[PDB]
Amino acid sequence: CNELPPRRNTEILTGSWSDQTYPEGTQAIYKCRPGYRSLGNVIMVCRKGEWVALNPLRKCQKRPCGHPGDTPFGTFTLTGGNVFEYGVKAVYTCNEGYQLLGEINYRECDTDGWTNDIPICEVVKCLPVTAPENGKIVSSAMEPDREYHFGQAVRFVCNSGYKIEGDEEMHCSDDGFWSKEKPKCVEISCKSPDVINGSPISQKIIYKENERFQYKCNMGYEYSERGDAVCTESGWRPLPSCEECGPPPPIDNGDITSFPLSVYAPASSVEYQCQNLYQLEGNKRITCRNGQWSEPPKCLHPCVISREIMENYNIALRWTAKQKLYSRTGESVEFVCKRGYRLSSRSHTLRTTCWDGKLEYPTCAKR
């Protein structure tokens, strides 16, 4: 032959090859280029006037890379082929809820082996959550402010006297953010109920916890089981149901003789009554004149005569009915010195009159 053996596409030369023309029978050994495999060396031979192939069957095939290996919480797919040969690319993808750590997501079968390392999938994580004001976190699993991961659910429960405001439960969602917003704990409060076929008895509109709401039913309707509602963190339990000038001012030691109502309008009137033995001063009936109530009366204070105070003054009741005696405003009480006592220096009378809770006790200073 009058040349060198042609440089094949998948083979390489091994000899020096410095001469120009080569005699007959010379064997040209072709080495298997990197990333290829064969049973032996592919040998070429020059005869007549061309470089023939002594081993037509022996050929260099693509080198087999091993199984690229599966990573936890992730699958892979093959690119540019269907066999683990030299020149393919195994692209990895993490499962739902798992994010890739690093920047290399492929493995390329090269002449030496699989390029880079097997990718690693980490579970996405949500920011830690703090306990809301006037509330706690009953759920989760221990550890104050530990980073939650995909899936874990969190529940919120307020303390006593507070009700929740917002979504009750949540969970670490797919994008590493919580599924719902952080709620709030507001003091338990209730509005005035709109009772159907009824009218409210009470005056107050805003209610706190465990406060009861009294109501009456319109004519033709009656109470459905219960006759009142209670303010709870969930609302009015049970719910009110009927099935088929302002209030007068308060006075000390007394009330009105009728059930109070909400509005009176001009020309209305109410009567007052004092507690037992208390004495009333003023007009016993008040009247609404031009959106204002007339002057309500007052209850004068009666005097209580205790044996404890009479013993200190060495005095006793003349007509012994106890040990204790009450005297209304204006009533007079007659005392006598105990046996062996005299009217004392700072006394003048044994008969004194009670005036709005003030009674002058006589003293006896022992003769």
- Chain residues 88-107 in contact with other proteins, contact rule CB under 8 A: 95-96
Which amino acid, residue 303?
A: C
Among the listed ranges 126-134, 182-190, 210-218, 343-351, the one in contact with other proteins (CB under 8 A) is 210-218
Among 62, 171, 184, 284, binds other proteins (CB under 8 A): 171
Listing DSSP states for 299-316 in one string gives: EEPPEEEEHHHHHHTTEE
Other CB atoms within 10 Å distance of the CB of residue 90:
22
Q: Nearer to other proteins by C-beta: 82 or 290?
A: 82
Q: Indicate left, alpha or beta for 9 from its phi (over 0: left) and psi (-120 to 50: alpha).
A: alpha
Q: Which of 333, 330, 332, 335 is nearest to 356 (CA)?
A: 330
Q: Which of residues 262-291 bind other proteins (CB under 8 A)?
A: 273-278
Among the listed ranges 237-245, 263-271, 290-298, 330-338, the one in contact with other proteins (CB under 8 A) is 237-245
Among 33, 254, 284, 361, binds other proteins (CB under 8 A): 254
Q: Nearer to other proteins by C-beta: 71 or 347?
A: 71
Q: Nearer to other proteins by C-beta: 146 or 289?
A: 146
Q: Which of residues 38-77 bind other proteins (CB under 8 A)?
A: 38-40, 61, 63-67, 69-70, 72, 75-77
DSSP structure class, residue 302: P
Among 208, 226, 307, 358, binds other proteins (CB under 8 A): 226
The answer for residues whose C-beta is within 8 angstroms of residue 285's C-beta and 6 or more apart is 269, 270, 271, 272
The tokens describing 243, both together, are 């099935």
The backbone torsions φ and ψ at residue 361, rounded to the nearest 5 degrees and listed phi first, read -80, 135
Q: Write each residue from 299 to 338 as x if it is in contact with other proteins (CB under 8 A), else as -, in one continuous string.
A: --xxxx-------------------x-x------------
C-beta of residue 149 within 8 angstroms of C-beta of residue 127: no
Q: Nearer to other proteins by C-beta: 6 or 34?
A: 34
**Sign of the torsion angle spanned by Cα atoms 11, 14, 18, 19:** negative
Helix (H) or strand (E) holding 230, with range, is strand 228-232
Give residue for tokens 């993490």: 94
Q: Write each residue from 122 to 151 as x if it is in contact with other proteins (CB under 8 A), else as -, in one continuous string.
A: ----------------xxxxxxx------x
- What is the β-pairing status of strands 254-256 and 235-236? unpaired
Q: In whole angstroms, how close is the CB of 14 to other proteins at the nearest point?
A: 15
Should residue 159 be labelled a site residue for other proteins when binding is judged by CB under 8 A?
no
The tokens describing 353, both together, are 């009159």
Q: In whole angstroms, how close is the CB of 341 to other proteins at the nearest point?
A: 26
Q: In whole angstroms, how close is the CB of 52 to other proteins at the nearest point?
A: 20
Q: In whole angstroms, how close is the CB of 16 to other proteins at the nearest point?
A: 23
Q: Nearer to other proteins by C-beta: 237 or 318?
A: 237
Q: Indicate left, alpha or beta for 276 from its phi (over 0: left) and psi (-120 to 50: alpha).
A: beta
Should residue 223 be labelled a site residue for other proteins when binding is judged by CB under 8 A?
yes
